[PDB]
């Protein structure tokens, strides 16, 4: 489970949660949202030039 804007502090923290996850034999991605914050994905091996 990945909460997008993790609010660690009670007053509020405003940091994203987008770890570089592995891609082994395919993945199943499900998103629950209400204001279209999920915008896509990037795929590759080293994610560089």
């Amino acid at each position: 489970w990945f909460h997008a804007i993790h609010v660690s502090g009670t007053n509020g923290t405003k940091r994203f949660d987008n770890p570089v996850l592995p891609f082994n034999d395919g993945v199943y991605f499900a998103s629950t949202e209400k204001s279209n914050i999920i915008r896509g994905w990037i795929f590759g091996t080293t994610l560089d030039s």
Partner: nanobody
Amino acid sequence: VQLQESGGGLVQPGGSLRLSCVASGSVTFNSMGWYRQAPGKQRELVAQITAGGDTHYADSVKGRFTISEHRGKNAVYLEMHSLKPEDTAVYYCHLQVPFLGGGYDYWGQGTQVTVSS
């Protein structure tokens, strides 16, 4: 792949073709539309039909073009009239299948309709 598109044929000026963006099955979309594209020219909008029923027309197409949806056969129908040679183009069927909030139209599979005497 999924959606498969075809229809139409070569005609002469003054004729009318009832082309359809014939689909392959029941589909979900919010604004179905049809494009054109001539060689050396960019794609230009022709008509727009939404789920609600809004019908958007380009400047060069009012007074001659009608759009009707057939939900029984799940296909919109694209009927031209008063055809002129300027309408010859690589006709496209951009779709409104939702994708990350809408997108990924299927206009790549087009039809070839040429208007000439």
